[PDB]
Amino acid sequence: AAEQQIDLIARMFAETGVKRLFQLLHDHAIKYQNQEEVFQLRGKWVAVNP
């Protein structure tokens, strides 16, 4: 519908949430666990030191 502004509103929401995601990245770099994922498999790399 002629490029509804809601798409840009959600987009700018995404680039704002980029900062909180980067804070999450610092948290991963600091410490979570030696755990893994559950996405289609059991076992993925540890994100303590990515």
Residues 1-50 that bind another protein (CB under 8 A): 11-12, 15, 18
User: Shortest Cβ distance from residue 15 to another protein (Å)?
Assistant: 4
Please say which residue, 3 or 15, places its beta carbon nearer to another protein.
15
User: What is the spatial distance between Cα 19 and Cα 3, in angstroms, rounded to a whole number?
Assistant: 26
Closest contact distance (angstroms) between CB of 3 and another protein is 15
3-class DSSP state of 47: coil
Contacts of 8 (CB under 8 A, 6+ apart): none
Which residues of the chain form contacts with another protein (CB under 8 A)? 11-12, 15, 18
